[PDB]
Write a protein that binds this ligand. Sequence first.
Ligand SMILES: Nc1cc2ccccc2cn1
Ligand SMILES: [Ca+2]
Ligand SMILES: [Ca+2]
Lengths: 110, 115
Amino acid sequence: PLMVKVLDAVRGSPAINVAVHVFRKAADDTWEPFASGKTSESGELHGLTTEEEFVEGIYKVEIDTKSYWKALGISPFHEHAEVVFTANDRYTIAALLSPYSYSTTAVVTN
Amino acid sequence: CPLMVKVLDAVRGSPAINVAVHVFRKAADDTWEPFASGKTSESGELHGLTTEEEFVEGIYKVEIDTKSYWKALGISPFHEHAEVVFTANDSGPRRYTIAALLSPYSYSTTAVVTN
Ligand SMILES: Nc1cc2ccccc2cn1
Ligand SMILES: [Ca+2]
Ligand SMILES: [Ca+2]
C-alpha cells in the first residue's frame, strides 16, 4: 500500500541508506510511530505496511535528509523532509533531494 | 527582514496569493512553540514575519497551508501542508528566503541564504 522512493540530484543516483520514519496522527493530535526502514540500493523502501494495517487517516513520512548528506560529506540546509498527507479509501511517495532544496510528489494508482 | 517566504502556483503560472504561513521554533523542552505567522500578498510574498532581534538561533519550522489554498480554488489536494525545518543562525545571523512551488500532488521548496 505504501512505498517511498528517494533520488539524489547532486550525484544523479538513487539515495541509498536513507532513514525513513512513518507516523500516524492519533486522536491526541500527536504523531504515533507506524513504520520505518532504510532505502535500498535502488533508493526504494518497500514493505512498510500491509493493507489491513494501513487505514484511513493522516500520515507523516519523515525522511532523514540531513544524515544522508552528512554521510556524503556534503553540507545540508534542512533538518529532514516531512511529507504529511491524508489517506482516503497504492501510494508512492517520491522525493528528489538537493542540499538546499527538495521536492516531493505522490503517485497514487489502482 | 531576516525571514521571507515566497509561494508560486505551478498550475496557473502565478503567485500563490493569500496562503497562510505559520512559523514555529523548537523550545528548550523540545516542543514547537509559536514564533510568527502571516499570509502571502498579491505577489506571493510574505514579509515582516520577524525582526533581527527576535530571530535568534534555533530550529525553526515553516508550515505553509497548501491544503486550504487548493480547497479555496475548488481543488482537492494531496498534502496537508508543506513544512520546511531548518537550523537558523548557527554561524551568525543570515537572511533566509524560503520559496515553495505548489501543485495539487507535489511541492518543492528551496532556501536562499545570504550574509
Ligand atoms: N519528487 C520528484 C521530483 C522529480 C523531479 C524530476 C524527475 C523526477 C522526479 C521524481 N520525483
Ligand atoms: Ca511493522
Ligand atoms: Ca552557534
